[PDB]
């Protein structure tokens, strides 16, 4: 299935790895991968099949009290769909800029370029700046000095967001998806371009340095909480778990297949292509270090812009750079567009199933899809302004990643493992797929996953360190509060639902608890 490769792999993993110093990210990344990553991904898919309904309705058949998990999930996809599409706007802008005789980021001789620029080759023939980096910052981004200075709304980027959103609306409205012969090209094209990029990176005259930085752990980094949540939550983000889409995916259709084998096959492959595409990014960074005569830790931005700094450099050192630059962004667009369709479609399905009486009562569903895209487009405008990067960084860290995913993951395992009961869950899976989860799955939900999620959460709070764009910009206090509001918007679902249903139920307290703990309500 195409949704198990995406911008989480080719854009999110390399930047987080680079931000956390590289090889020290891989220790907590693998620990969560098997400890919680795969076991939770199997858990969600079973829930969807077991009920054969949306991510919100299923919990009614498992533990009515904790139905808020479904609400917590649907809000997460709503926030994710707002800022994830912004990456397609940057790719769209790059693609149009690629339709030129010479790529603008190859050299710095234009009006938007600083007087401090020095070409990489001549930089080692001061506080010089590479043309590639400042093209991203000044031309594509026009970075503001801080989040407190929104600046002007970039009209060019606003049109790019409109173009991608329009494509999403028509595709969703008309149900356009890869089902025919085009599936071979759509699925194969990401891996074909990534192999060429990977080969280009390794063959660079300084690839070796980058791959050592990528793989050798600085174990003194593991004494900081940041790398544990960043690594652990990246597993949840990249698997699209805790979003409720996987529950909807299972309910859509599943039969005559071993779900256990499929989930491990999908989950190992999704993680493999992140690790594999890590070499490509770091290999390029290694070469940029020696060419620029600076540390590998400082060559590029320690943020979402890494993918828009490294890969554009790689395409510049290939025969006919324009040809490969075009192919890259029509692979960053198609790989990200298919993902956007799945989560926009899932969000629409999740929302209509709550109020089918009015929205799903007729043709209003078409109007609802336009409304969802419209409001999302307006929300995305905040991240298109000159200071939009700080908003985008804030959204990525908090809106649909970080503690919020841990919050959802902990309750999902806890409810099934202890409240619903592990034995009953294993009993269900026996009926569905014929064999029990086994000790690895049973203990992971019961012990490993709750402990890891809880441990990271406490370890963060005890050793709290505030978010910072790149590695030098400190967010203001109000900005941090806004970020926590986005994360709390999903976490607060579970407690809010619990109290609402405890109040909306008749009888003494204990009767209400017993009634809402028993499934099938």
């Amino acid at each position, epitope marked *: 299935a195409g949704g198990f490769v995406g911008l989480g792999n080719v854009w999110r993993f390399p930047y987080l790895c680079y931000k956390n110093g590289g090889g020290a990210f891989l220790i907590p990344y693998f620990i969560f991968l098997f400890g919680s990553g795969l076991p939770v991904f199997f858990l969600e898919i079973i829930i969807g099949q077991y009920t054969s309904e949306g991510g919100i309705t299923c919990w009614e058949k498992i533990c009515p009290l904790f139905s808020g998990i479904g609400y917590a999930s649907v809000v997460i996809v709503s926030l994710l769909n707002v800022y994830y599409i912004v990456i397609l706007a940057w790719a769209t802008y790059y693609l149009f800029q690629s339709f030129q005789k010479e790529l603008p980021w190859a050299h710095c001789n234009h009006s938007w370029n600083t007087p401090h620029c020095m070409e990489d080759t001549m930089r080692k023939n001061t506080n010089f700046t590479s043309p590639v980096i400042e093209f991203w910052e000044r031309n594509v981004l026009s970075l503001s000095p801080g989040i407190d200075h929104p600046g002007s709304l970039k009209w060019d980027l606003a049109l790019c967001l409109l173009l991608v959103w329009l494509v999403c609306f028509f595709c969703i409205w008309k149900g356009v998806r890869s089902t025919g012969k085009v599936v071979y090209f759509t699925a194969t094209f990401p891996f074909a371009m990534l192999l060429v990029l990977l080969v280009r990176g390794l063959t660079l005259p300084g690839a070796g340095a980058g791959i050592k930085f990528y793989l050798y752990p600085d174990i003194t980094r593991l004494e900081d909480p940041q790398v544990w949540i960043d690594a652990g939550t990246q597993i949840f983000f990249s698997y699209a778990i805790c979003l409720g889409a996987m529950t909807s995916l299972g309910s859509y259709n599943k039969y*005559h297949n*071993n779900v256990y084998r499929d989930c491990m096959l999908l989950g190992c492959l999704n993680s493999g292509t992140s690790f594999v595409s890590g070499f490509a990014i770091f290999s390029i960074l290694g070469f940029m270090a020696q060419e620029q005569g600076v540390d590998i830790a400082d060559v590029a931005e320690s943020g979402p812009g890494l993918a828009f700094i490294a890969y554009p450099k790689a395409v510049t050192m290939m025969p006919l750079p324009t040809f490969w630059s075009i192919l890259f962004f029509i692979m960053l667009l198609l790989l990200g567009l298919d993902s956007q369709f799945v989560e926009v479609e899932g969000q629409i399905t999740s929302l209509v199933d709550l109020y089918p009486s009015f929205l799903r009562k007729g043709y209003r569903r078409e109007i609802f899809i336009a409304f969802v895209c419209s409001i999302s487009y307006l929300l995305g405008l905040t991240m298109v302004t000159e200071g939009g990067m700080y908003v985008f960084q804030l959204f990525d860290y908090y809106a649909a990643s970080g503690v919020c995913l841990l919050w959802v993951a902990f309750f999902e395992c806890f409810v099934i493992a202890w409240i619903y009961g592990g034995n*009953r869950f294993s009993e269900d899976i026996r*009926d569905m797929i014929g*064999f*029990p989860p086994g000790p690895w799955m049973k203990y992971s939900w019961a012990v490993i996953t709750p402990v890891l999620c809880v441990g990271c959460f406490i370890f963060s709070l005890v050793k709290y360190v505030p978010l910072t764009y790149n590695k030098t910009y400190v967010y203001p206090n109000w900005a941090i509060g806004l970020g926590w509001s986005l994360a709390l918007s999903s976490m607060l679902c579970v407690p809010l639902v619990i109290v609402i249903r405890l109040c909306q139920t008749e009888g003494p307290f204990l009767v209400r608890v017993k009634y809402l703990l028993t499934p099938r309500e």
Partner: antibody
Amino acid sequence: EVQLVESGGGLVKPGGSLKLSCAASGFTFSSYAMSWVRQSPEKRLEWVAEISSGGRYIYYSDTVTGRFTISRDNARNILHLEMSSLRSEDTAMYYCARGEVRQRGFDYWGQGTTLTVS
Amino acid sequence: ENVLTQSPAIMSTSPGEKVTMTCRASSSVGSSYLHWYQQKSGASPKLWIYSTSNLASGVPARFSGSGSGTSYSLTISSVEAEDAATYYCQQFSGYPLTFGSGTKLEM
């Protein structure tokens, strides 16, 4: 898993009722699904019913869907099969088998008890 | 019910000679959901082959299994004196479980 032993077999008449039992030992009876298999005097094997590990899912053969009731006692580690409308064709030897994993089949079989409805 | 039919009900065999019995299903059966059981005269059946290719704990490597979809069979490299027994094919894909007619090796 070492021992599975059936008991309770005997002679009855048409339209009668009987309760078959199968004690289990050597393994955690609660965590393994149990099934009943029937072997007619012609040596033909016929499936009767199966009960999940926890007893929440119970299934019956078409011939005994509305006549036989399957139950288990996890605390006592004993498997029970109840017949209420035994017919003339119900005479056979009954075996209790462990069927936890569908992809692996019945790992172990009991000694079995003969039932006749003469 | 997913009726399972075994063609060679009776197979007279001499020691050393290889034999093979074919089990046919009236409906689609998964590869992992078909198993073979051996039953010796006056004894309860014992699992022999599962997943259509995997040998049980006690069955020697002498036996092997093959098949998929709607036709399944197992073969014996060299029938020994201890191989004289009745073999039944069973399907687990559908829940109204059905056992094959059974093929009895009389020698």
